Nucleic acid binder design. Structure first.
Ligand code: NA
Ligand code: NA
Ligand code: NA
Ligand code: NA
Length: 327
DNA sequence: CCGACACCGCATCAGC
DNA sequence: GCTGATGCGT
DNA sequence: GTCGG
């Protein structure tokens, strides 16, 4: 985990570029290209001396190598400096930081003169439900969640779920499950023996109880299988109130639950490699199932999975702890 | 050279 | 009103 | 923007 001081200037630059591609130029693939470049460089255990050196890293190509050369010789990048001062682009880029406001909404807003949160605040009528909530908790949503708070949050979630029906199975996934010391939000995977792929309010009852005890404070979206909202830990009489947090709850069929827990636990890298290894072993693993691949490439019916290990067993790969799934 | 870069639930829009 | 497409987010 | 069939 090389200190940012190594190539932080370079990594910051690529990430800033990444954001403008995504939020202003609406070029999602260039956005991911810059992210990938910044990721590989952020991991590089050496202070980069030239673009040629960086180009050796997978994800860093001709254009980025050239930009690195400019940054190393001048300490900046003309194209980035210019776009920072651009009132329109900087505003569009900024507005996307509000949950619910994507590249399209941000452009539409800036086009009609709405460029700041203050502007947004004065124009509630132009915001949909999600966006109003995103505006309401703008600061809180950008704050991270200490593991200690994630544990208290888990305590409430697991308690209320069991209270609704002791047969529910709930698992808080994400980096939190891998042992991370901080999380950006809470991702809860829920299932019930009564719910399977080929079988016929399970989610509603849980969301409702969480609201009843005033843990869940707002709802961004809610259907029969996925809830996205806001929650807040109860504050101690006198204590500063805790920040509002983003929490998602997904109801998944029992027979596909562990493939789900596996995937949403990550990391994104571990998923890539495991899915790779699975292929060569003659298996295709996605978010919902693991299936065998015949000699001509024809996928067969999904294999029974009753635990994460079952998945690991199928592809000959000793079960690895979540704490060791960094890659 | 030029297509891939993931799949999908929900809220909401666009077209009929 | 219904159906499909789009925006957004994870 | 980068990769690769
Ligand atoms: Na490269
Ligand atoms: Na946003
Ligand atoms: Na954003
Ligand atoms: Na019971």
């Amino acid at each position: 985990a090389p200190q940012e001081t190594l190539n932080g200037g370079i990594t910051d630059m690529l990430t800033e570029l990444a954001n403008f591609e995504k939020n202003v130029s609406q070029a999602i693939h260039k956005y991911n290209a810059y992210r990938k470049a910044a990721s590989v460089i952020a991991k590089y255990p050496h202070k980069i001396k030239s673009g040629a050196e960086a180009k050796k890293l997978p994800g860093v190509g001709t254009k980025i190598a050239e930009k690195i050369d400019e940054f190393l010789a001048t300490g900046k990048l003309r194209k980035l400096e210019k776009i920072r001062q651009d009132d329109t682009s900087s505003s569009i880029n900024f507005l996307t930081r509000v949950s619910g406001i994507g590249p399209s909404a941000a452009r539409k807003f800036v086009d009609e003169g709405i460029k700041t949160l203050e502007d947004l605040r004065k124009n509630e009528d132009k915001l949909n439900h999600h966006q109003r909530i995103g505006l309401k908790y703008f600061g809180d949503f950008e704050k991270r969640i200490p593991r200690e708070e994630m544990l208290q949050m888990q305590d409430i979630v697991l308690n209320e779920v069991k209270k609704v029906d002791s047969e529910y199975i709930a698992t808080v996934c994400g980096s939190f499950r891998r042992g991370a010391e901080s999380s950006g939000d809470m991702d809860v995977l829920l299932t019930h023996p009564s719910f399977t792929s080929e079988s016929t309010k399970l989610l509603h009852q849980v969301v409702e109880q969480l609201q009843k005890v005033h843990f869940i404070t707002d709802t961004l979206s809610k259907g029969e299988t996925k809830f996205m909202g806001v929650c807040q830990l109860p504050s101690k009489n006198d204590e500063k109130e805790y920040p509002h947090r983003r929490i998602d709850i997904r109801l998944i069929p029992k027979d596909q639950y562990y493939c789900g827990v596996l995937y949403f636990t990550g990391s994104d890298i571990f998923n890539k490699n495991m899915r790779a290894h699975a292929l060569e072993k003659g298996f295709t693993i996605n978010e919902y199932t693991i299936r065998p691949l015949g000699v001509t490439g024809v996928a067969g019916e999904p294999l029974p999975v009753d635990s994460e290990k079952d998945i690991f067993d199928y592809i000959q790969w000793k079960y690895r702890e979540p704490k060791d799934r960094s890659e």
